[PDB]
């Protein structure tokens, strides 16, 4: 039932889609016409590639472009339109087999496929890989640890898999995992894996890695190296504060090495997130230099080179707050932060 | 701005090269003393252990 790890049997779903958009491109001419392989490219080509995200979701609030379009529909107007482009599609739907003559049939009357693809194809290597896929989601979904990564480890040592689950369960698993491994170590091995410094997007048929859960190094940010960013705070903050240390600091030069390009080129969390690994940093040498003023009795203790090492932190963090609001970074609740670290001034007093 | 007067007949205290202010030849060597005292102390902070004081007398 789960999403499998593979190139999709590439033999009648690659020509199913050249009579999908045929037709598509048919209707659509003769559409644009009333309101007066290839054809797959210049179909996107008429409604553009897929941000770095989903689902082109944004707002919902701003231009009141009035569509009342009429409805405009009279089942006459429909086949008006449709009468022509249907007889185009016979031409190239009589040298497409049996299957795919009924499939064009059943979709161009507009029923969909009850016959999942990834539910036929018969092959020994991908045979088992959906069994494993499937087998390892219904692990987690019970939470079987022992049984879980068993499959999981044989899964990537079959010939199928591109990241894909294998970042997205291949983390939990070792969070679940509470023997070795911190999806960290996976997680890094994962960022240098993908790095993808390339800013490539749109052009051919991305139909074997579609989900912006795997690819960047462009723009569109890869989502296990912001998870690992965000692991690696919380796995600084466990047992902190309750010359081995340095995490915090791996943490400051390991973003450091980035200051944009594609992440710190885009902006947010790694703004963001940075700041808040700098902000608990800060929070730390204040405990650190806390209790009871300091520690307690005061610090006489050479005026307060503590206080001054964090102010210029304090006020370091509150530029990076700001760059991460100012280039249109909508993550960040300001008003909080900044009561927390005014709050947090009045302990440093 | 308040003192309004120059020469080698006053003692011209300057930072950096940055002129602030003048005083008398004895408050001159006054200043220096007692700065070097506040420099070797720790209760200026204000002013570093490193800071280079430049006295000049007449």
């Given at each position: 039932?789960?999403?499998?790890?593979?190139?999709?049997?590439?033999?009648?779903?690659?020509?199913?889609?050249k009579?999908?958009?045929?037709?598509?491109?048919?209707?659509?001419?003769?559409?644009?016409?009333?309101?007066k392989?290839?054809?797959?490219?210049?179909?996107?080509?008429?409604?553009?590639?897929?941000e770095?995200?989903?689902?082109?979701?944004?707002?919902?609030?701003?231009?009141?472009?009035?569509?009342?379009?009429?409805?405009?529909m009279?089942?006459?107007?429909?086949?008006?339109?449709?009468?022509?482009?249907?007889?185009?599609?016979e031409?190239?739907?009589?040298?497409?087999?049996?299957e795919?003559?009924?499939?064009?049939?059943?979709?161009?009357?507009?029923?969909?496929p009850?016959?999942?693809?990834?539910?036929?194809?018969?092959?020994?290597?991908?045979?088992?890989?959906?069994?494993?896929?499937?087998?390892?989601?219904?692990?987690?979904?019970?939470?079987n640890?022992?049984?879980?990564?068993?499959?999981?480890?044989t899964?990537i040592?079959?010939?199928?898999?591109?990241?894909?689950?294998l970042w997205?369960?291949?983390?939990?698993?070792?969070?679940?995992?509470?023997?070795?491994?911190?999806?960290?170590?996976?997680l890094?091995?994962?960022?240098?894996?993908y790095?993808?410094?390339?800013?490539?997007?749109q052009?051919?048929?991305y139909?074997?890695?579609?989900?912006?859960?795997?690819?960047?190094?462009?723009?569109?940010?890869?989502?296990?190296?912001?998870?690992?960013?965000?692991?690696?705070?919380?796995?600084?903050?466990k047992?902190?504060?309750?010359?081995?240390?340095?995490?915090?600091?791996?943490?400051?030069?390991?973003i450091?090495?980035?200051?944009l390009?594609?992440?710190?080129?885009?902006?947010?969390?790694?703004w963001?997130?940075?700041?808040?690994?700098?902000?608990?940093k800060?929070?730390?040498?204040?405990?650190?230099?806390?209790?009871?003023?300091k520690?307690?009795?005061?610090i006489?203790?050479?005026?307060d080179?503590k206080?001054?090492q964090?102010?210029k932190?304090i006020?370091?963090?509150?530029?990076?707050?700001?760059?991460?609001?100012?280039?249109?970074?909508?993550?960040?609740?300001?008003?909080?932060?900044?009561?927390?670290?005014?709050?947090?001034?009045?302990r440093?007093? | 701005?308040?003192?309004?007067?120059?020469?080698?007949?006053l003692?011209?205290?300057?930072?950096?090269?940055?002129?602030?202010?003048?005083?008398?030849?004895?408050?001159?060597?006054?200043?220096?003393?007692?700065?070097?005292?506040?420099?070797?102390?720790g209760?200026t902070?204000?002013?570093?252990?490193?800071?280079?004081?430049?006295?000049?007398?007449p």
């Open positions: 039932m789960f999403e499998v790890p593979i190139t999709l049997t590439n033999r009648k779903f690659a020509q199913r889609r009579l999908k958009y045929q037709y598509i491109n048919y209707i659509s001419r003769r559409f644009d016409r009333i309101s392989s290839d054809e797959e490219r210049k179909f996107w080509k008429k409604y553009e590639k897929p770095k995200s989903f689902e082109i979701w944004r707002t919902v609030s701003s231009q009141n472009k009035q569509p009342i379009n009429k409805q405009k009279t089942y006459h107007n429909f086949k008006k339109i449709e009468k022509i482009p249907l007889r185009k599609m031409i190239p739907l009589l040298h497409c087999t049996k795919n003559k009924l499939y064009f049939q059943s979709i161009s009357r507009g029923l969909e009850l016959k999942t693809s990834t539910s036929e194809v018969r092959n020994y290597r991908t045979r088992h890989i959906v069994t494993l896929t499937d087998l390892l989601h219904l692990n987690v979904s019970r939470h640890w022992s049984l879980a990564y068993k499959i999981f480890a899964l040592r079959i010939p199928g898999v591109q990241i894909k689950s997205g369960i291949g983390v939990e698993i070792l969070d679940n995992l509470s023997n070795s491994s911190s999806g960290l170590d996976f890094q091995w994962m960022c240098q894996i790095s993808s410094k390339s800013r490539f997007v052009n051919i048929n139909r074997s890695i579609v989900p912006p859960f795997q690819t960047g190094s462009r723009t569109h940010t890869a989502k296990f190296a912001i998870t690992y960013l965000w692991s690696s705070l919380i796995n600084c903050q047992s902190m504060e309750p010359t081995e240390n340095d995490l915090l600091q791996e943490l400051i030069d390991k450091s090495e980035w200051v390009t594609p992440p710190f080129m885009e902006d947010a969390e790694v963001f997130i940075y700041a808040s690994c700098h902000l608990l800060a929070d730390t040498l204040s405990r650190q230099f806390v209790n009871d003023n520690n307690n009795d005061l006489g203790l050479d005026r080179i206080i001054n964090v102010i932190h006020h370091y963090v509150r530029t990076f707050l700001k760059i991460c609001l100012d280039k249109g970074g909508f993550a960040v609740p300001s008003r909080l932060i900044e009561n927390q670290l005014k709050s947090f001034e009045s440093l007093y | 701005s308040h003192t309004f007067a120059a020469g080698p007949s003692c011209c205290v300057q930072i950096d090269g940055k002129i602030i202010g003048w005083v008398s030849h004895e408050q001159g060597k006054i200043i220096a003393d007692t700065l070097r005292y506040w420099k070797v102390e209760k902070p204000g002013l570093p252990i490193d800071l280079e004081i430049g006295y000049v007398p």
